[PDB]
Amino acid sequence: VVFTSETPFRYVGCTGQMNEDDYEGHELLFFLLREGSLQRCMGCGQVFK
Amino acid sequence: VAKIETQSLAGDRFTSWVETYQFHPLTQDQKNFDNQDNAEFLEDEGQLKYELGVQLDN
Amino acid sequence: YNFPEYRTGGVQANPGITAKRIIKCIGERLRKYDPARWENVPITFKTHFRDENGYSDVATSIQIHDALEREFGIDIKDRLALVTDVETAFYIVMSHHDPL
Amino acid sequence: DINKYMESQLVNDTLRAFVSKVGKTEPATWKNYSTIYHKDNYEAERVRHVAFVDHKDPHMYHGLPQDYDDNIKPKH
Amino acid sequence: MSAILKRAAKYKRVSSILCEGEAHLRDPFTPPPVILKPPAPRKDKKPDDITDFPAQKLIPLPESIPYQEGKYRPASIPMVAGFFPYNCYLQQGKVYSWCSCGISQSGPWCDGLCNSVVTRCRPVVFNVSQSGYYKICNCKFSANAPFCNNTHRKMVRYHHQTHRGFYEIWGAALFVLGWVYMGFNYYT
Amino acid sequence: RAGPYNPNRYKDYYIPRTLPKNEEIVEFVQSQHSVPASPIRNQRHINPVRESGPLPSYDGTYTMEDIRAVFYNTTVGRDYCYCQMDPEEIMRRVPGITRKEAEFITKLGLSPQEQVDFAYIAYNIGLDIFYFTNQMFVARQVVTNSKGEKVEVLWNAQCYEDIAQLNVGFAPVLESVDYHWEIFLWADPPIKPNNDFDLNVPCTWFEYEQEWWMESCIQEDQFNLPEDERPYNTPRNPHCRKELWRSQDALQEEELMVNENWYPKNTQYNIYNQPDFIKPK
Amino acid sequence: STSTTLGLPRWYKRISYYIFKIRYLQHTKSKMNGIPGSTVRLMLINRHFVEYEVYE
Ligand SMILES: CCCCCCCCCCCCCCCCCC(=O)OC[C@H](COP(=O)([O-])OCC(O)COP(=O)([O-])OC[C@@H](COC(=O)CCCCCCCCCCCCCCCCC)OC(=O)CCCCCCCCCCCCCCCCC)OC(=O)CCCCCCCCCCCCCCCCC
Ligand code: FES
Ligand code: FES
Ligand SMILES: [Zn+2]
C-alpha cells in the first residue's frame, strides 16, 4: 500500500524482492502508481495499491 | 506451415516457419525451375532421388 | 533383512517418533555434558533449557545442536536459531528437508 | 499435543487447496506460517512438498490442489 | 495432388525416432507414449469453446528425484559445469542433494538454483551406506546419478570431434606453441 | 481571466459545531467498549499462492522443455510472422483457453512457438490479450484473489531508474506529449518502498527464469553428447540405492519407539518413574 | 518523442518480451502506412526506365 494525501497518483520505484545478501532484488524501475486499481511491477510481480 | 531447422558450422541453430506455397522445386542441375504438379525428386520407394533445391519467395 | 522405506520425508510423517528421537538424543547429550543437573530431570516435550528467568545458556544449546546434528544427520545453523527447549528442537528438525 | 500438530497440518492443507482452487493457481510456500530459519523468503530454496517416484505413483498429487475435489474433499 | 496420389501407393514411411530413443525406457516420471484420437468435429464453433480433445496425464515437477541405480537420463540438457569429477568425502547415512542442472554455486550439491532456471533437472537426493571418498559427477551426464562413470571423457572426445571444438582446441594449442616458440627463439 | 482566489475566506465544516452531551459521552464510551473495534491492517501473508499461475509440469500438454525451446529463437523484426498456429492446437496445448483468445493470439506476430507460449502464460496468469499497450499501463490482467473478489491488475509502463525518462501521461498513447515544469506538483515526494525481510514472500512471479538467460548463454555454445553415445546401465555404486539408507539399529529403534510406553531405559536414575525400570550399571 | 522501450525497459520475464514484441509489431505496422507493399515497390523500382527509342 502506497499512500497519497488526496493526490491522484504518486511516483513509485520498485527494486523487487529485497534480500539480505544484496539489499535490492532488481534494478530500480520507476512508474506512476495511479488511483483506481491494483498495479504490479512486471519485472518482479510486486502488486502495488 | 512447415518448420525448417538448420545449423551453421559453428553450432548455431536456426528455426524458420515458412508457408507451404513458398516452396518452388528446382531441377536436378538447379539451373532452372522445376515444374510443379509434375516432378520426380523422390524415387519409387519414396526417398530423395537427388539433392533437391527449393526456392522460397520470402 | 529389514529393507529401508522408499518413501522419503518419513521424519515429517511421524511427529511422535521424531519427538521421541529428539527427546532421547537431547537427554543423552545433556546427561553426558551436565550430569550434575540433568541426570535426575525427566526430559519431556515441554522441557526447556533456560534459567528460571528465561535466560538461555549458549553452551548447553550448542551441545544440543551437536546432538541433533549427529542424531538426524543435519546441519543446524547455530546463528539463526538457538535450541532452548524441545519444542524449538522439534521445529528445527521438522523444518529441515533432509533429516534421517 | 500431537493432535494439535496434525490438525494444524490438515487445516492448512485444506486451506491451501481451497485457496488454490478459488484462485486457479497453486500454493506458493507449503509452509503453514512464515518464519525466517530457511531464508526461503529471499533465497531460492522453496519449501514445496511434492514427492513421487514414477508416473504411476498414487502420492504424486499430494500437496497440490489437484488432490482435492471441487467440494474441497481430501481424496481424489 | 493427383501426381502425388499416383505414386503414394508405393511410398514407405520411416520412423521418427533418431539419436534420441524413448524417454520412458530410460527415465521414470515419463508415461509411455499414448495415441490420442480427436473426437468428432464440433457442429458449431463458438467464440468461448474450450478444447474437446481427450485429456493428457499431467506429471508435476518433482521436488527431487531418487538415485536411479546406474540408469539416469537427464530430464533436460544440463550445463556441463566441468569435465572432471569431484572427489568428495561423503558421510555415512547423511542425505546429500546432488545438483542435476549444473548451475549451482555450491559445488556439486543442489543449493537452490534449480528453482531459478527453466529446466526439468531436479536434485538427486541420495544416501551412501558407508562414509568415504566418492567421485561425484560434475558433468551432470553420468548414468550413475551422483557418481562418475567416466562419461566426461566421452563428452570431451565428442567436443573435440565437433568442428568448432576442434578449432578451439587447436587454437589454444597453437597459442601455447607460440609461447613455446618464443621461449625457444629467445636467444636469436 | 478568473479573479483572485483565497480559499481561507470560505468556511469549512470538518468539526461539528455543537458539543456532546455528558450522558451521550458516557453512553458512547460504554457502547464502544462493549463491542469489538474495527480491525487494523495486518501485513502477514496467510496462504500465499503463485502469482504466475500453476508451476510448469514435468510432463503434460505444456512442459518446461517448451519454454526453453521458446527461449532459443527470440527475435523482434519489423514484420509479422504470418505463419499462424492452428487455434484448435493452441486450445489443445492450453486446455482452458477459449477459441477467441487462441484466434487473436494467432493474429499477432509471434512465431508459433511463441504463440503457444503466450497462450499458456495469458491463460495461467489471467492476462487480457485484447489490451493495447500504451504508456499508462502495458498490460491488464483479471484475477480472482483468495477472497474471490475478481480484481484487476494493471501492469504499468516503467522506466529504468530515470524519472526524467518516464512518460508521465494520462492518455492511451505511446508518445510523450505532456511536459511538466513542476514534476512534483503538490510537493508530495515519490517513494521507493523498502520491504521487510520477515514480511517477504517466496518468489513466484516466474521465479524459474532468474538464471535462465545466464544458462541459455552458456548452452548456446555447448555441444551435448547424443543419447546414442552416452553410456547407460553402468554398474550401480556399491553403497548407494534408490531407497535412502537406514541402519538396522535405527530401524529397530523406530520399531521400538512405535510403542506407546517407550522410555529411554538407559538412564542411571528412574527419571520417568517407570514401574519396570532396572538400573543398567 | 516516443520512447524506444515502449514502456518496457527490461525484459526480466519472457512475458515482457512478448508484450514488447506485440506492441513493436503493431507500432511498425502503423508506421509503415502509406508506404507501398513489397510487390508494388519492387514493380515501381524495376520498371523505372521508360526511355526507349524504338517501339513495336
Ligand atoms: C588456428 C587453428 C588451426 C586449426 C584449424 C582447424 C579448422 C578450423 C576451422 C573449423 C571450423 C570452425 C568454425 C568456422 C566458422 C563457422 C561458422 C560459420 O557459419 O561460418 C560461415 C561464416 C560466414 O558468416 P555467417 O555464416 O553469416 O555467420 C557466421 C555464423 O552464423 C556465426 O559464427 P560466429 O559469429 O559465432 O563466428 C564468427 C567467426 C567465425 O569464424 C571463425 O571462427 C574462423 C576462425 C579462423 C579459422 C581458420 C582456419 C580455417 C580452416 C580451414 C583451412 C583449410 C586448410 C587446408 C586447405 C587449404 C590450403 C591448402 O568469424 C571470424 O572469425 C571472422 C573471420 C576470420 C577470418 C580469418 C582469416 C584467416 C586467413 C588466414 C590465411 C591468410 C593469412 C594472411 C592474410 C591475413 C589477413 C586475411 O564464415 C565465417 O564467419 C568465417 C570466415 C572465414 C572462413 C575461411 C577461413 C579460411 C582460412 C584459410 C587459411 C589458409 C592458410 C594458408 C595456406 C596453408 C596451406 C598451404
Ligand atoms: S538441482 Fe542443480 S541447482 Fe538444484
Ligand atoms: S563428471 Fe565424470 S561422468 Fe560426469
Ligand atoms: Zn519490481
Residue A47, chain F, CB below 8 Å: the answer is yes
Residue A41 annotated as binding site = yes
Whole-angstrom distance, CA of residue D33 vs CA of residue D20: 17
Residues 6+ apart with CB under 8 A from E75: E27, E29, E100, E119, E120, E121, E122, F58
Element (H, E) at A47: strand A47-48
Of the candidates C14, C15, C25, C34, the residue with the CA atom closest to the CA atom of residue C74 = C25
Q: Which one, of E149, C74, B19, E125, lies nearest residue F82 by Cα?
A: B19
Give residues 118 to 147 of E whose Cβ lies within 8 Å of F: 118-120, 125-130, 132, 134, 141-144, 146-147
Q: How many Å apart are CA A42 and CA E19, to the nearest integer?
A: 40
F216 CB-near residues (< 8 Å, 6+ apart): F68, F71, F72
Backbone angles phi, psi at B2, to 5 degrees: -125, 130
Element (H, E) at F256: helix F248-257
Question: Positive or negative CA dihedral for E168, E171, E177, E179?
Answer: negative
Cell of G15: 512475458
Coil, strand, or helix at residue B4? strand
What residues are paired with F140 via a beta bridge?
F154
Cross-strand partners of B2: B18
Distance CA F90, CA F116 (A): 6
Which runs of E-coded beta strand occur in F97-254? 137-143, 151-156, 159-160
DSSP string, C35-53: HHHHSSS---TT-B-B-TT
E18 labeled binding residue: no
C-alpha G17/C-alpha A9 separation (Å) is 27
B-D interface (Cβ pairs under 8 Å ≥ 3): no
SS3 E169: helix
Q: How far is C2 from chain F (nearest CA, A)?
A: 7
| Residues sharing a CB contact under 8 Å with residue F268, sequence separation 6 or more, in sequence order | C31, C39, F279, F280, F281
- From F60, E60, F91, select the one nearest D66 (Cα to Cα): E60
User: Nearest to residue F234, comparing CAs of E68, C60, E61?
Assistant: E68
Does E169 contact C at CB distance below 8 Å? no
CA–centroid distance, F158 to ligand 4, in Å, is: 10
Single out the residue of B27, B7, B6 nearest to residue B18, CA to CA. B6
What residue spans of chain E are helical by DSSP H?
A: 2-7, 23-26, 151-161, 163-184
Contact partners for chain B, using 3 or more CB pairs closer than 8 A, are E, F
G vs C contact (3+ beta-carbon pairs below 8 A): no
Residue type, G23: R
Which amino acid type is present at position F5?
Answer: Y
Burial (CB count <10 Å: 0-12, 13-18, 19+), residue C78: middle
For residue F92, count other CB atoms closer than 10 A to its CB: 21
Q: Is C68 within 8 Å of C25 (Cβ atoms)? A: yes
Which mutation among E100, E144, E151 tests ligand 3's pocket best, with the greatest number of atoms within 8 A of CB? Answer: E151
Cβ of F160 and G7 within 8 Å?
no
Please tell me the distance between residue E177's alpha carbon and the centre of ligand 1 in angstroms: 20
- Contact predicate F110/F75, CB 8 Å: no
CA atoms of C97 and D38, how far apart (whole Å) = 10
**Cell output for A24:** 535490492
Write the burial class of residue F73 (CB in 10 Å: 0-12 exposed, 13-18 middle, 19+ buried).
middle
Report d(CA C20, CA C8) in Å as an integer. Answer: 19
The C-alpha atoms of residue D60 and residue F51 are separated, in whole angstroms, by: 23
Resolution in A: 3.0
User: What are E99's three cell numbers?
Assistant: 545438483
Q: Whose CA is nearest to atom 28 of ligand 1?
A: B8
The per-residue b/e assignment along B30-39, b for 16 or more CB within 10 angstroms, e otherwise, is: eeeebeeeee
Q: Give me ligand 4 centre to Cα F50, in Å.
A: 16
CA separation for the pair D30, D12 (Å, rounded): 9
- Helix and strand counts by DSSP (H, E) for chain D: 1, 0
Q: Is ligand 3 within 6 A of the CB of residue E88? A: no
A12: helix, coil or strand? strand
Q: Other C-beta atoms within 10 Å of A49: how many?
A: 14
Q: Is the CB of E99 under 6 A from ligand 3?
A: no
Neighbours of E19 (CB within 10 A): 8
| Interchain contact, G22 vs F110, CB within 8 Å | yes
E100 is in an annotated binding site: yes
E29 CB within 8 Å of a chain D CB: yes
Residue in D30, D41, D50, D67 to test binding to E, most E beta-carbons within 10 Å: D50
Q: Hey, which of E65, E80, E86, E99 would you mutate to test ligand 2's pocket, going by the most ligand atoms within 8 Å of its Cβ?
A: E99
Size of interface B-F (CB pairs under 8 A): 20
- The Cα F137–Cα F131 span in angstroms is 9
Q: Which residues, judged by CB distance below 6 Å to any ligand atom, belong to the binding site of ligand 1? A: B 8-10, 12; E 163-164, 166-167, 170-171, 174
Query: In which residue are the cell numbers 572432471 written?
Result: E84
Q: Do chains C and A touch (3 or more CB pairs under 8 A)?
A: no
| Chain F residues 210-239 with a CB less than 8 Å from chain E | 210-212, 214-215, 218-219, 221-239
DSSP helix/strand/coil, E6: helix
What is the DSSP code (8-state) at residue F7?
A: G
Ligand whose nearest atom lies closest to the CA of E112: 2
Q: Provide the residue type at E153 as one letter.
A: R
Q: How far is F114 from chain D (nearest CA, A)?
A: 22
CB E24, CB E33: distance < 8 Å: yes
**Separation CA C8–CA F243 (nearest Å):** 8
Question: Quick one: chain A helix, strand, coil %, rounded to 5?
Answer: 0, 35, 65
Please write down the HEC assignment for all residues of E60-108.
CCCCCECCCCCCCCCCCCCCCCCCCCEEEEECCCCCEEECCCCCCCCCC
Q: Is F223 on the interface with B (CB under 8 A)?
A: yes
| E70 φψ region: left (φ > 0), alpha (ψ -120 to 50), beta (else) | left
For residue F188, the 8-state DSSP code is P
Cβ distance of B37 and E162 shorter than 8 Å: no
What distance lies between CA E187 and its chain's CA centroid? 52
A14/chain F closest Cα distance in angstroms = 6
Q: Which atom of ligand 1 is nearest to the CA of E167?
A: 8
Cβ pairs bridging C and F (under 8 Å):
44
d(CA A29, CA G39): 44
The minimum CA-CA distance between E80 and chain C, rounded to whole Å, is: 26
Q: Do C73 and E93 touch (CB under 8 A)?
A: yes
Measured distance CA(D52)–CA(E58) in Å, rounded: 13
Q: Which three three-digit cell numbers place residue B26?
A: 528446382
Rounded CA-CA distance F14/F175 in Å is 43
Distance E47 CA to ligand 1 centre (A): 55
Residue of D nearest to A23 (CA): D42
Nearest to C86 by CA among C48, C35, C53, C51: C48
Contact D44, D27 (CB under 8 A): no
CA D58 to chain A, closest CA, distance in angstroms equals 34
Strands (E), B1-58: 2-7, 13-18, 23-25, 54-56
The residues near F125 (Cβ < 8 Å, ≥ 6 apart) are: F51, F52, F53, F141, F143, G15
User: Using a CB-CB distance cutoff of 8 angstroms, which residues of chain C are in contact with residue E91?
Assistant: 73
What residue type is E40 in one-letter code? A
Ligand 4 centroid–CA F190 distance in Å is 16
Is A31 within 8 Å of A14 (Cβ atoms)?
yes
According to DSSP, the β-strands at F159-160 and E132-136 are unpaired
C-alpha angle with apex F201: F197 to F202, nearest 5 degrees?
Answer: 110
User: Binding residue per annotation — E116?
Assistant: no
Task: Please report, as a single letter, which amino acid is at residue F3.
Answer: G
Q: How far is CA F1 from CA E137, F5, F105, F225, in A?
A: 82, 12, 53, 81
Cβ distance of C100 and E93 shorter than 8 Å: yes
Residue list, ligand 2 pocket, CB within 6 Å = E 99-101, 103-104, 110-111, 113-114, 121-123
Q: Please give the C-alpha separations between residue E54 and each of E34, E127, F58, F65, F121, in angstroms, as whole numbers.
A: 11, 41, 19, 22, 22
Length of chain F: 281
Interatomic CA distance for residues B16 and F221, integer angstroms: 20
DSSP labels for F28-42? HHHHHTTSPPPP---
For E31, what's the count of Cα atoms within 13 Å in the CB-facing half-sphere?
14
Q: CB under 8 Å to G14, separation ≥6 — which residues?
A: F67, F70, F71, F117, F121, F206, F209
Between chains, do F223 and E143 touch, taking CB under 8 Å as contact?
no
d(CA A11, CA E6): 71
Terminal C-alpha separation, chain C: 19
Distance CA A24, CA A14 (A): 9
